[PDB]
Design a protein around this nucleic acid. Sequence first.
DNA 1: GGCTGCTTCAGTATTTATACTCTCAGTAATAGTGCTGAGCTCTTTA
Length: 46
Amino acid sequence: YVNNKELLQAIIDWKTELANVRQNDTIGLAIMLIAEGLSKRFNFSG
DNA sequence: GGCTGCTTCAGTATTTATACTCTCAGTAATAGTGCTGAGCTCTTTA
């Protein structure tokens, strides 16, 4: 799906900003992505 | 620049497998609750 590392980056960055409102959606798109990919796991998707 | 053929779609005729951890929360059942009366307790003296 998606490089875990870049996600660490984005979230570190929203950490730093929340240390000041919203967050980037890059990480949010990736979240949708990973949710939907897990959905196709084998116990579920049944 | 208005102009005809393809086109795509739309309308007919039972019974679903694997958290965890508090942690709280406020609730509904539930025993604590105290009456009423009354029924027996009891004695009285006429």
